[PDB]
Amino acid sequence: MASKVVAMGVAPWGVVRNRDTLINPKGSFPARYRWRGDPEDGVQFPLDYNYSAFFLVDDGTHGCLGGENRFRLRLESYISQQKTGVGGTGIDIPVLLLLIDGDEKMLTRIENATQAQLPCLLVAGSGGAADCLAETLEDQGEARDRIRRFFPKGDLEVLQAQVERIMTRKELLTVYSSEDGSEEFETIVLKALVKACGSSEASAYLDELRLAVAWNRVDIAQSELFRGDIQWRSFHLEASLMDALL
């Protein structure tokens, strides 16, 4: 309203209310969804109305959680390996995952994503499953695992093994410094993106450059993108220069 940004929904098929209103084999171009029903249950939930598109994963269940983690992770990974149109003539579309609190299942999700080589960002003070990893990155470990997370599963050393596995690939995880209500992390996103690439081919770093241009993180771009490691060509920077001028 203050203006483009698009919101995409990925929810299990089975926790959405009034499903029968959304069944049509011959086509459902029109549809009316009752998203303000009086009854309320802990299983079924109403769809939001601010999202431009929805994805309902069907796992053959009448209600549950975690049935979309695998599909969501696969989709994110595929996006991470896709160009921004024009076939291969475009450039890779950056991707990352933002973590805010969670539980043991959320920690497993983070571990799977990291093993998929997708950047993840954690926010300090969110709560369990997010602050614990932030503290681990900043750094007793067992005591913290029991403290920052509820008693259940705390004794389970599988949590310790998961934390160790996360640390094994800390190159992707990045903590969010609140900095007393900083409310500014574009630089953090760029830093995560640059530290999550490593390899310098000058053809996969264009997207980070375009993001930096879109923002005012010139210092970040100079420090990493134009640190001399990468072999920037002439035609490479034409579009970025035009954008910066405009």
Partner 1 sequence: NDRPEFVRLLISHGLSLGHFLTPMRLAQLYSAAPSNSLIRNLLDQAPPDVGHVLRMLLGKMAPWSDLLLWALLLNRAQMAMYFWEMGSNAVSSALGACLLLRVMARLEPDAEEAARRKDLAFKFEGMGVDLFGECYRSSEVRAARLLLRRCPLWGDATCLQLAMQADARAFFAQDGVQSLLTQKWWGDMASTTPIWALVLAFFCPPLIYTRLITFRRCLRRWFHFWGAPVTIFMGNVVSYLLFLLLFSRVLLVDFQPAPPGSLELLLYFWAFTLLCEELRQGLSGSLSQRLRLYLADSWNQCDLVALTCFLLGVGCRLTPGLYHLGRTVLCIDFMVFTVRLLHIFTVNKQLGPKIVIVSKMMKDVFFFLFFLGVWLVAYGVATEGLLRPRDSDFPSILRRVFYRPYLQIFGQIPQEDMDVALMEHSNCSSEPGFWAHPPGAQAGTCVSQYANWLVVLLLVIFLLVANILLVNLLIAMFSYTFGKVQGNSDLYWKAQRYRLIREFHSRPALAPPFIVISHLRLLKEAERKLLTWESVHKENFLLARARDKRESDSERLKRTSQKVDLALKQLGHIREYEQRL
Q: Which residues are annotated as a binding site for ATP?
A: 36, 47, 233
Residues 17-36 close enough to bind partner 1 by CB under 8 A? none
**Span near partner 1 by CB under 8 A; candidates 27-35, 74-82, 113-121, 175-183:** 175-183
Backbone angles phi, psi at 120, to 5 degrees: -130, 140
| 160, 138 contact by CB (below 8 A) | no
Would you state the structure tokens that stand for residue 76, as one six-digit string? 């994110």
- In angstroms, rounded to a whole number, what is the distance separating the alpha carbons of residues 44 and 27? 24
Among 87, 183, 199, 235, binds partner 1 (CB under 8 A): 183
Identify which of residues 21 and 182 has a Cβ nearer to partner 1 in the complex.
182
Instruction: Please report whether residue 143 would count as binding partner 1 according to CB under 8 A.
Output: no
Residues 84-103 close enough to bind Ca ion by CB under 5 A? 92
CB of 21 to partner 1, least distance (A): 25
In the beta sheet, which residues pair with residue 57?
A: 12
Among 39, 152, 181, 228, binds partner 1 (CB under 8 A): 181
Identify which of residues 15 and 96 has a Cβ nearer to Ca ion in the complex.
96
Instruction: Please report whether residue 5 would count as binding partner 1 according to CB under 8 A.
Output: no
Among 30, 184, 198, 234, binds partner 1 (CB under 8 A): 184
Identify which of residues 68 and 224 has a Cβ nearer to Ca ion in the complex.
224
Task: Compose the 203-222 pattern: x for residues touching Ca ion by CB under 5 A, - for all others.
Answer: -x------------------
- Return the ∠ at Cα 128 (arms to 126 and 134), rounded to 5°: 70
DSSP letter at 155 equals S
3-state secondary structure of 73: helix
CB of 174 to partner 1, least distance (A): 14
In terms of Cβ atoms closer than 10 Å to its own Cβ (0-12, 13-18, 19+), residue 222 is exposed
**Span near Ca ion by CB under 5 A; candidates 10-18, 95-103, 198-206, 221-229:** 198-206
List of residues 6+ apart from 200 with CB closer than 8 A? 229, 230, 231
- In angstroms, rounded to a whole number, what is the distance separating the alpha carbons of residues 22 and 30? 10
| 178, 122 contact by CB (below 8 A) | no
* Contact residues for partner 1, defined by CB under 8 A: 1-2, 181-184, 245
* Residues in contact with Ca ion by the rule CB under 5 A: 92, 204
